[PDB]
Design an enzyme around this catalytic site. Structure first.
Site, PDB file in Angstrom:
ATOM      1  N   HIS A   1      35.824  48.303  43.778  1.00  8.77           N
ATOM      2  CA  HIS A   1      37.007  48.643  44.581  1.00  8.77           C
ATOM      3  C   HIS A   1      36.786  49.816  45.537  1.00  8.77           C
ATOM      4  O   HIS A   1      37.720  50.529  45.880  1.00  8.77           O
ATOM      5  CB  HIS A   1      38.198  48.943  43.651  1.00  8.77           C
ATOM      6  CG  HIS A   1      38.494  47.814  42.714  1.00  8.77           C
ATOM      7  ND1 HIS A   1      38.813  46.556  43.176  1.00  8.77           N
ATOM      8  CD2 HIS A   1      38.449  47.728  41.363  1.00  8.77           C
ATOM      9  CE1 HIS A   1      38.982  45.747  42.138  1.00  8.77           C
ATOM     10  NE2 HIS A   1      38.803  46.439  41.032  1.00  8.77           N
TER      11      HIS A   1
ATOM     12  N   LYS B   1      38.012  43.647  30.638  1.00 14.30           N
ATOM     13  CA  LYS B   1      39.431  43.896  30.384  1.00 14.30           C
ATOM     14  C   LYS B   1      40.234  42.615  30.081  1.00 14.30           C
ATOM     15  O   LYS B   1      41.108  42.668  29.236  1.00 14.30           O
ATOM     16  CB  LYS B   1      40.086  44.840  31.418  1.00 14.30           C
ATOM     17  CG  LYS B   1      40.123  44.294  32.848  1.00 14.30           C
ATOM     18  CD  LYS B   1      40.760  45.332  33.823  1.00 14.30           C
ATOM     19  CE  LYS B   1      40.579  44.861  35.282  1.00 14.30           C
ATOM     20  NZ  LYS B   1      39.146  44.810  35.628  1.00 14.30           N
TER      21      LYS B   1
ATOM     22  N   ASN C   1      47.791  42.167  34.697  1.00 14.55           N
ATOM     23  CA  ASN C   1      46.826  41.815  35.720  1.00 14.55           C
ATOM     24  C   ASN C   1      46.089  40.473  35.435  1.00 14.55           C
ATOM     25  O   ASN C   1      45.382  39.960  36.292  1.00 14.55           O
ATOM     26  CB  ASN C   1      45.847  42.984  35.923  1.00 14.55           C
ATOM     27  CG  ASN C   1      44.984  42.823  37.145  1.00 14.55           C
ATOM     28  OD1 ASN C   1      45.486  42.588  38.241  1.00 14.55           O
ATOM     29  ND2 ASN C   1      43.659  42.954  36.966  1.00 14.55           N
TER      30      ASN C   1
HETATM   31  N1  LIG Z   1      52.134  44.350  52.656  1.00 16.22           N
HETATM   32  C1  LIG Z   1      51.281  43.920  51.990  1.00 16.22           C
HETATM   33  C2  LIG Z   1      50.427  43.257  51.307  1.00 16.22           C
HETATM   34  C3  LIG Z   1      50.655  43.255  49.946  1.00 16.22           C
HETATM   35  C4  LIG Z   1      49.821  42.550  49.114  1.00 16.22           C
HETATM   36  C5  LIG Z   1      48.739  41.883  49.643  1.00 16.22           C
HETATM   37  C6  LIG Z   1      47.991  41.117  48.605  1.00 16.22           C
HETATM   38  O1  LIG Z   1      46.623  41.318  48.512  1.00 16.22           O
HETATM   39  C7  LIG Z   1      46.207  41.544  47.226  1.00 16.22           C
HETATM   40  C8  LIG Z   1      46.998  41.411  46.056  1.00 16.22           C
HETATM   41  C9  LIG Z   1      46.420  41.710  44.796  1.00 16.22           C
HETATM   42  C10 LIG Z   1      45.078  42.130  44.753  1.00 16.22           C
HETATM   43  C11 LIG Z   1      44.415  42.448  43.567  1.00 16.22           C
HETATM   44  C12 LIG Z   1      43.073  42.875  43.646  1.00 16.22           C
HETATM   45  S1  LIG Z   1      42.154  43.261  42.395  1.00 16.22           S
HETATM   46  O2  LIG Z   1      41.130  44.198  42.894  1.00 16.22           O
HETATM   47  O3  LIG Z   1      42.918  43.759  41.234  1.00 16.22           O
HETATM   48  N2  LIG Z   1      41.441  41.886  41.905  1.00 16.22           N
HETATM   49  C13 LIG Z   1      40.354  41.324  42.705  1.00 16.22           C
HETATM   50  C14 LIG Z   1      40.168  39.827  42.372  1.00 16.22           C
HETATM   51  C15 LIG Z   1      39.176  39.193  43.339  1.00 16.22           C
HETATM   52  C16 LIG Z   1      39.107  37.692  43.173  1.00 16.22           C
HETATM   53  O4  LIG Z   1      39.994  37.097  42.520  1.00 16.22           O
HETATM   54  O5  LIG Z   1      38.136  37.102  43.691  1.00 16.22           O
HETATM   55  C17 LIG Z   1      39.044  42.070  42.490  1.00 16.22           C
HETATM   56  O6  LIG Z   1      38.724  42.441  41.348  1.00 16.22           O
HETATM   57  O7  LIG Z   1      38.296  42.290  43.453  1.00 16.22           O
HETATM   58  C18 LIG Z   1      42.421  42.972  44.853  1.00 16.22           C
HETATM   59  C19 LIG Z   1      43.057  42.663  46.016  1.00 16.22           C
HETATM   60  C20 LIG Z   1      44.364  42.250  45.945  1.00 16.22           C
HETATM   61  C21 LIG Z   1      44.914  41.965  47.162  1.00 16.22           C
HETATM   62  C22 LIG Z   1      48.473  41.849  51.014  1.00 16.22           C
HETATM   63  C23 LIG Z   1      49.338  42.555  51.858  1.00 16.22           C
END
Ligand SMILES: N#Cc1ccc(COc2ccc3cc(S(=O)(=O)N[C@H](CCC(=O)O)C(=O)O)ccc3c2)cc1
Length: 439
Positions: free
Chosen positions: A183, A115, A138
């Site tokens: 996920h 993506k 994103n």
């Molecule tokens: N209240 C509250 C609260 C809000 C937000 C958070 C923040 O935590 C995240 C923000 C954005 C996130 C985005 C994503 S994701 O799944 O889109 N991207 C990760 C990227 C992982 C990495 O960079 O290693 C993945 O693909 O697994 C996962 C977890 C995420 C966790 C914690 C607590």
């Protein structure tokens, strides 16, 4: 939409949360911010007049809200958020706020792998046409930071999480590139629930771009009148392979000999196809779109050669945050000597077993780390070492590296258990590679 006088609560700071804060203030609305983290990223950047609550959610604030703006990193299934929904309290995310304001067409891209590459390619296709394009979501800038009345096209990478809180997207062209397990820590109803979240991207899309090789990218009602397809051996956009050459084709017609591309590999060729289908649907000129395909060099952390020295290639594929992505790195991988493969981090409850078929033979070594290091080591214990950190794994493997070898960071996991993001993981790998890969 008009937010004046509403009680607005933003859940989750970070750069996304900060952009939401700026969005409301500029519109004459002072939101409140909460985060389950004690000192979330960006706290020190929060304006002083903004009330904040950290370390837990505040149910008094949530139940008082007229609008809740949820970070994609908090589950809608969080009991607090679930309760607010049950009460009829409106919940949106930053992408929803963006769609309600955007004054240019939006190309919207999602999928488990490819993506960021496809998003970036479509951006470059638009730039080659002299179009004022805003690219983000994103990837890069959070969408709200792109809003500009002079922007002529938006190209957004959208995660499944962002899509869950979005309802007003009417994309000029939208794709799900593929759906492979990821996920699962956020989808307790499994693969089809994750798929459903991505399927939202097609709602009210003018053109849907589907993967002819991946049934899960098709709408539930099946491919329809709006649906253009890409694939390897079939699809409206497909590949034509000959002696020692590959062409991009659209409905039978050759459009590009991939020797002109800087990217290589089948998955990058189907990425090129998906980007071209989106660009075409968006009305961008074909010629300038093809030119973009020949100039694009790739993204950092995406099978990136960070050091080639003393007969060893050190490759940063830190963007491999799921099993499907690591598969794309390993499938058809040529290594002269030994592959020293770094795996680990937060595996998000994935089944790592599909990687096992790539790890047979005498020229593979696994160095497994982070939260799920032990589960990765278990893929082939006889050729595996486990450490706590990626640095430990690199200092462990470096003495064993011989000319002809490859050192590959392609970890199949999120980095978030030990790092800020996969970029920081990639950057640290690159630093350590440069230290260890030279006398
Ligand atoms: N209240 C509250 C609260 C809000 C937000 C958070 C923040 O935590 C995240 C923000 C954005 C996130 C985005 C994503 S994701 O799944 O889109 N991207 C990760 C990227 C992982 C990495 O960079 O290693 C993945 O693909 O697994 C996962 C977890 C995420 C966790 C914690 C607590």
């Amino acid at each position: 939409a008009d937010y004046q006088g509403k009680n607005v609560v933003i859940i989750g700071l970070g750069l996304t949360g900060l952009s939401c804060v700026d969005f409301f203030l500029a519109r004459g609305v002072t939101p409140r911010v909460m985060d389950t983290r004690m000192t979330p990223p960006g706290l020190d950047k929060l304006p002083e007049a903004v009330e904040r609550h950290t370390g837990s959610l505040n149910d008094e604030w949530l139940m008082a809200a007229d609008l809740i703006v949820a970070s994609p990193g908090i589950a809608l299934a969080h009991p607090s958020l679930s309760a607010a929904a049950d009460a009829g309290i409106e919940i949106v995310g930053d992408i929803e706020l963006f769609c309600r304001e955007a004054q240019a067409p939006i190309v919207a891209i999602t999928g488990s792998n490819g993506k960021s590459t496809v998003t970036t390619l479509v951006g470059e296709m638009a730039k080659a046409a002299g179009v004022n394009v805003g690219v983000g979501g994103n990837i890069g800038l959070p969408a709200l930071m792109l809003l500009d009345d002079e922007c002529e096209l938006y190209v957004l990478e959208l995660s499944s999480f962002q899509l869950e809180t979005t309802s007003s997207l009417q994309a000029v062209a939208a794709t799900i590139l593929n759906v492979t397990e990821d996920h699962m820590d956020r989808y307790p109803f499994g693969l089809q629930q994750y798929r459903a979240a991505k399927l939202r991207i097609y709602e009210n899309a003018k053109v849907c771009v589907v993967n002819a090789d991946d049934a899960l990218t098709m709408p539930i009602r099946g491919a329809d009148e709006r649906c253009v397809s890409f694939g390897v051996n079939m699809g409206d956009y497909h590949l034509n392979h000959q002696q020692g050459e590959t062409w991009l084709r659209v409905k039978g017609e050759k459009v590009l000999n991939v020797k002109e591309m800087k990217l290589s590999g089948q998955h990058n060729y189907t990425n090129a196809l998906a980007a071209l289908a989106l660009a075409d649907a968006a009305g961008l000129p074909r010629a300038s779109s093809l030119k973009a395909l020949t100039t694009f060099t790739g993204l950092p952390h995406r099978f990136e050669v960070v050091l080639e020295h003393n007969g060893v290639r050190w490759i940063n594929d830190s963007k491999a945050t799921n099993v499907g992505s690591t598969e794309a790195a390993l499938n058809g991988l040529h290594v002269d000597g030994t592959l020293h493969l770094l795996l680990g981090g937060d595996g998000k409850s994935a089944d790592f077993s599909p990687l096992a078929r790539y790890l047979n033979g005498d020229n593979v070594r696994l160095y497994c780390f982070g939260r799920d290091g032990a589960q990765l080591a278990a893929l082939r214990p006889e050729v595996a070492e486990q450490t706590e950190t990626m640095e430990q794994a690199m200092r462990l493997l470096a003495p064993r590296v011989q000319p002809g070898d490859m050192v590959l960071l392609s970890p199949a996991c999120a980095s978030l258990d030990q790092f800020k993001n996969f970029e920081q993981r990639g950057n640290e790998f690159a630093r350590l590679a440069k230290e260890l890969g030279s006398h």
